[PDB]
Symmetry: D2
Subunit: 247 residues, 4 copies
Amino acid sequence: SQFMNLEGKVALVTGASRGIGKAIAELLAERGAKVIGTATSESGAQAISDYLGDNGKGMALNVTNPESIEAVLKAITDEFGGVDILVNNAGITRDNLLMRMKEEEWSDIMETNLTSIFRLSKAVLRGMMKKRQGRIINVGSVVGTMGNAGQANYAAAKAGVIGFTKSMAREVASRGVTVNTVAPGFIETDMTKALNDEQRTATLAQVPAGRLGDPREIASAVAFLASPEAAYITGETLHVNGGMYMI
Amino acid sequence: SQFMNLEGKVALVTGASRGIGKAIAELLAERGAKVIGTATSESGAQAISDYLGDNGKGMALNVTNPESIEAVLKAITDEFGGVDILVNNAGITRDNLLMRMKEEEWSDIMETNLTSIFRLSKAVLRGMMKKRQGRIINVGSVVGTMGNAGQANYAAAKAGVIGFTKSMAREVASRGVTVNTVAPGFIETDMTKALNDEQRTATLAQVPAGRLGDPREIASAVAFLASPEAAYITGETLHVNGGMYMI
Amino acid sequence: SQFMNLEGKVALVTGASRGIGKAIAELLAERGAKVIGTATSESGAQAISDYLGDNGKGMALNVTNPESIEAVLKAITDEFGGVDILVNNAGITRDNLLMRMKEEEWSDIMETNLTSIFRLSKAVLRGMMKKRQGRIINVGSVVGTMGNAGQANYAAAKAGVIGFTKSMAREVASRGVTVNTVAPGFIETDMTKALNDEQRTATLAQVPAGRLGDPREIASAVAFLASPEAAYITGETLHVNGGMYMI
Amino acid sequence: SQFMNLEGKVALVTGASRGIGKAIAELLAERGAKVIGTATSESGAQAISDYLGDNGKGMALNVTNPESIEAVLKAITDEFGGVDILVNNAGITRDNLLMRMKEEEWSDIMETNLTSIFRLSKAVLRGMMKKRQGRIINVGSVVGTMGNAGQANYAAAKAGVIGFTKSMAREVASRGVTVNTVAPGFIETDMTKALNDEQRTATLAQVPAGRLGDPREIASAVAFLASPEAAYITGETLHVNGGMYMI
Ligand SMILES: [Cl-]
Ligand SMILES: [Cl-]
């Protein structure tokens, strides 16, 4: 139908070889977008090409490297036209209580989870503004809003993503580009699957929904914000956390 | 498709004869819901039946009257089965600076815009909890979060809707019922159409989007939250305001 | 010293016979304010006069009765001059899960915890605006921001206090009147003392501070906002909850 | 008196040669703290020693240099004992619309306004935790919460400060260390004094207070949070913005 239809849009989803990033890339494709998903290695890139088939392709992308960013985008633009939707999902954790937290654990989190957004957003914004149409959607975290012990770095970067989102939203609203954040809670992934029973039960104790989120549930919120129907939403943080936190 | 498909769901949308409430009712019907929209009068009810056709019907409902509430719901339940989706959109304004604000202008706002949500939510929750499935979505306002001079009553009620929403979200999350608020900014409606040029330009000065939202844009955010895909969103306030405010 | 000095200010503190309200009244008096504290009965009023001594007095006040409000304020104004600082602390609970919550338990909460703030604020604002100086400080609750199961009425009223506060803050900021909310978490009081061990330990599990707050800690936050030094704080909600919730 | 008395506390205030940082250092001293204020150069350090006199001293501190941080703290600890209060006020701006924003303008803001907090907090936390007593207070900005066009970097760092604050607050609450942010709005400083009439009037148009803040008003909020009386406040953002934004 004409409802949340992304035919004619070109979407770039970073960190799309598995879990949330994969779900996003698949759902945007299913809604009609041409999707370029990225991974850190070529084998991941290939896995992305494999699941996307005729709806898009996989590329190798180092989100902390300007040269990689410039090369990946040139290839997209050459083949598909300018990016209409950017989903910043690439991200890592380097957990530790502050007194154990290395300089590199802090800086790597800042570079990968916050500075990347600045670089990638900057690389796509010009075309979006000239076309008077765009979506930038950042995959944040409940931890950005809630805070969490042992994750001061991750929390700082993810909260930073929101300050960036709000400022960019103001900057580009009049030109028809929205900028928003989706903030997952505890979503079932490989990382959460590796947790032991105690750890999972403990975390479930803080989720009124009494279960973990599915990656497809984050994907749905992303495709919603990516849609023409979400044009009047900007500078927003959409929380998908089973009631873990309520703002 | 299977995406945001509301076939099999029964939706009750209050205050549905025009604008936002109408847009909501029409979109939920288009996504497959059986929709009962309400109005204060039988002529409004009929206009509702007229636009819904085979997808639902209009009923006369006084949201400040328990007897009306009981009668409308009995009729729905008899014909359609229990309500799966409640959208509380009925609401009014009684604007005045505090020193001019009558006792009745305060109390009418509280009754219509806040106590109604208590009554209607209570009237539908039992079946939702037994079925282990439900959506309650309140149409709030940016004013509830931002505040606005000359609207301390409206702001209080709309902010009250959020405290109610969070508490109910916690109460019923484990039973698969979500409770959320959609908070419109400045949406083009009859009320906003009656504003003079100065007033509209002044208000647009505070919207980075530089336009009024469309009622359909509010409808889309409600339909999204009403969908199966939104099962992991609860206790949330979804702002649809063109950047007027950013939380 | 000249620091947070309230000499020359007249403060009205509702619900001041014990706990938080008493602590507030005693601290404002200690910082130099002439303090009128209220209670529902004459015996409470007397207990208030007894602890205030030469720094103020107790009066009987029914916050849900306009006639009582008019009479108490006339007395204050006659003796002391216009009220410079209003602290709305009077409030009650009527807890129940929604399906057990009586019409009267909802309406009594709305009247006592929200409509009271409308009435009392309205009754003091005119003199504050003419003098181009004033403080209105509402004692809210973490529950207004967080939500809580079994307290949807209380949450709604306390969240309503914030919408009212923001709107009034906008209405009167240019005239040198601030309007703010102090939002206590779990504070040691008679109510919390009556809780059993299980209930207290369960609630302490959600407080990172690992203790209940003291009424004096709420008093200090109110005295701070009441001070000249706080002239540039308005429309704000000051959370004093030991980390129970973080916004 | 015994009210907000900081006798026996050792306070480190970064960026204290002028404006807000100076006001903070002076007020903490006035409330009885031994204060070490810092500046980037020795001449600033000397100016700080000059205004502090017998209440403390100035030191040269490069907040983006671990070696400088280690040397300044050793000297404090040697002379005064462990730091009890840390105020992170050192900060810069590197404004530009995103498309004009250099890599270095982004990174310098991240390093100076966010990574510094991680380094300085880490350098002081151990002693605070062993003593079971501490205050870390970060001077943020309304722009962290509101966003602002042309300041996406500043907004991101200042929002990042909050995510860090909330996480650290959780980490150390049980050990009697609070962590909080004070978020100034438009405060009169050299930077705001250099603005032209149009720019100032434009910005005042967004402040309901209808004036700029004074540095002493930020200082008051800082000394309040630094006090024993604020022990039950942690993970909070205290907004001092004349109503410019209302959360
Ligand atoms: Cl309404
Ligand atoms: Cl209360």
